Design a binder for this molecule. Structure first.
Ligand SMILES: O=C(/C=C(/c1ccccc1)n1cnc2ncccc21)O[C@@H]1C[C@](OC[C@@H]2C[C@@H]2c2ccc(Cl)cc2)(C(=O)O)C[C@@H](O)[C@H]1O
Length: 382
């Protein structure tokens, strides 16, 4: 009962976080077709997102210890709602970047509160499977996102499918003020149960962190820019690219679910085969797609990318728990997430700068060669 509500008001709550952390990506074609923006401008917006999400992710890991988790989750969800409402009324790129920077700060203040809630309602042996099911909320939101964004944006507006999402997040924030609970002892339901500088100077954390940097950077490149690659170079329509995002996130659902079965260091080999599959799938996506190339192929390549991108994200999370000491394990996850969103910042603005200064094909060549160089450098370290 309480563990059903505590996970349905969050799985349906954090999907209205990830549906709005990528809602600039979901209505990217209408935003570019209506008003002209630089690719540096779009990369500047999504890099303000990634930098703000880095800073707020790293500070909210301490704010979970200082401050409660239902209050930060509800307040950040209401802030995301107000941000997207003002983002639909706004029209120019500096205020786009400012409101999307506030969206990055708001998105950072909500996911470690989900960590504190799910850490204090389930057994510590069952942290992993409920974390995986809550991490499939990103795949669910990004799977149902761009299809709705295209089928509503062609019919009404991008501003209308931002205002509806903002109002929905305000309504579910007023719901999450009252649905979830931070501590079961507040309602009385039988509550259950330096070395830092060595951890910053431990080599396995840096290898894990640059690996999750390059995996989250390649995933952020391919997610936030693959549909735009298909529209502006490969001649696909906006529907094909939005369905490519959707097939990427359906493949990510299958990946982050079947990263739990296939894990149960022998996990490192599964992880490296899966990153090699990511590099080979992105090479096929850079070469083999064509105007004459069918839609079913590009959905299969999206699914094979997602099965090989969110898969190593889930395995990197599992290894980042297992390599962390139990006294200050949240600091290790904060360092890993900070390097992840440094990878997201590298995926936002310098990637689009490489895109508009050489080519989109050269941009995905840069992303494919840094993913291939990382997979080759990780085939050598083991
Ligand atoms: O958090 C993990 C993995 C585990 C884990 C537990 C058991 C087996 C294998 C892995 N984990 C650590 N603390 C946890 N507390 C509750 C539930 C799971 C917890 O990976 C991290 C996931 C990652 O950061 C999320 C930040 C920690 C907070 C959070 C938010 C929501 C939740 Cl549900 C949990 C924690 C992200 O999703 O962006 C990226 C990187 O930081 C990874 O390292």
């Amino acid at each position: 009962y309480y563990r059903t509500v505590i996970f349905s008001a969050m799985f349906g709550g954090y999907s209205l976080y990830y549906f709005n952390r990528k809602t600039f990506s979901f209505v990217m074609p209408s935003l570019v077709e209506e008003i002209p923006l630089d690719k540096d401008d779009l990369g500047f917006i999504t890099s303000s997102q990634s930098a703000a999400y880095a800073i707020s992710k790293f500070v909210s890991g301490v704010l979970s210890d200082q401050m409660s988790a239902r209050w930060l989750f509800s307040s950040g969800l209401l802030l995301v709602g107000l941000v997207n409402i003002f983002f639909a009324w706004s029209s120019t790129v500096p205020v786009f970047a400012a409101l999307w920077f506030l969206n990055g700060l708001a998105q950072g203040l909500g996911w470690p509160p989900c960590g504190k809630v799910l850490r204090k309602w389930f057994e510590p042996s069952q942290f992993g499977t409920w974390w995986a099911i809550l991490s499939t909320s990103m795949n669910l939101a990004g799977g149902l996102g761009p299809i709705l964004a295209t089928i509503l944006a062609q019919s009404y507006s991008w501003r209308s499918t931002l205002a509806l999402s903002g109002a929905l997040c305000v309504v579910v924030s007023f719901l999450c003020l009252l649905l979830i609970h931070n501590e079961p002892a507040d309602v009385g339901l039988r509550n259950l149960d330096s070395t830092l500088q060595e951890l910053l100077l431990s080599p396995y954390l840096w290898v894990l962190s640059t690996g999750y940097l390059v995996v989250f950077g390649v995933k952020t490149c391919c997610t936030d820019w693959g549909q735009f690659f298909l529209i502006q170079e490969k001649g696909q329509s906006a529907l094909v690219g939005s369905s490519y995002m959707s097939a990427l996130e359906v493949g990510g659902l299958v990946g982050s679910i079947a990263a739990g079965y296939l894990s149960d260091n022998p996990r490192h080999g599964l992880l490296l085969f899966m990153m090699a599959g990511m590099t080979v799938s992105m090479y096929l996506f850079r070469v083999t797609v064509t105007s004459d190339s069918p839609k079913l192929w590009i959905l299969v390549l999206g699914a094979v990318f997602g099965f090989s991108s969110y898969g190593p994200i889930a395995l990197f999370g599992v290894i980042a728990n297992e390599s962390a000491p139990p006294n200050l394990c949240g600091t290790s996850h904060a360092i890993v997430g900070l390097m992840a969103n440094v990878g997201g910042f590298l995926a936002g603005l310098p990637f689009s700068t490489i895109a508009k200064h050489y080519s989109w094909s050269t941009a995905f060549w840069v992303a494919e060669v840094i993913c291939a160089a990382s997979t080759a450098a990780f085939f050598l370290l083991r």
